[PDB]
Every structure is written in structure tokens, then in C-alpha cells.
């Protein structure tokens, strides 16, 4: 029932909630680790001693 | 004579001994400290292994 006109503005909203979806991505920071980002290898936390 | 020779080496003996004693101590407390040093040194490599 939606003419052409909403579903462009849908499809912006859209854009914009991905838009943000790849900042969370790209700037979720811990002390210099871009951990739910697009390079984030997985960490090791040395837990006790005798490695 | 012979005693009296006798006696006299084995007082400055035991004064070399107290001498010994007390260099030993001198190296205990050189190593305590290196210890105290290698327990931090430990410490710190545990905290920086983690990733």
C-alpha cells in the first residue's frame, strides 16, 4: 500500500540505522582495541602464572 | 708452648669464621634484594602478557 515516497524515506531510515550499525563497528573502543570491529583478532587474558 | 700456639690460631680462626659469617651475610642480602627485584619482574611480565 506504501507509494514509491515512503518507501524511499523507509529505505533512509534504513540507511541511517546501518550507518550507525558500521560506527559502532568501527569505534566500539578499549583502551585502543577496536574490539567488535572489522580487525579484531582474539585476545589471550594470561590468566595465572606458568605461561 | 704448643698449646698456647695452639690457642692463639684457633681464636684468630674464629675470627676469619665471624669474618666468613658476615661475608655470607653481605651475599644473602645482595640476593634477597635481586629476589625482591625478580618477584616484580614476574609480576609485571604476568600483567603484560595479557593481550
Redesign the interface.
Known amino acids: 500500500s506504501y507509494s514509491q515516497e515512503q518507501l524511499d524515506s523507509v529505505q533512509g531510515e534504513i540507511n541511517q540505522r546501518l550507518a550507525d550499525i558500521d560506527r559502532i563497528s568501527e569505534q566500539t573502543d578499549f583502551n585502543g582495541v577496536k574490539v567488535l570491529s572489522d580487525s579484531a583478532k582474539p585476545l589471550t587474558l594470561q590468566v595465572g602464572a606458568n605461561d | 708452648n704448643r698449646f698456647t700456639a695452639n690457642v692463639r690460631g684457633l681464636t684468630q680462626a674464629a675470627r676469619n669464621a665471624n669474618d666468613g659469617i658476615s661475608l655470607a651475610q653481605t651475599t644473602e642480602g645482595a640476593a634477597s634484594e635481586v629476589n625482591t627485584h625478580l618477584q616484580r619482574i614476574?609480576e609485571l611480565t604476568?600483567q603484560a602478557?595479557?593481550?
Open positions: 614476574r604476568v602478557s595479557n593481550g
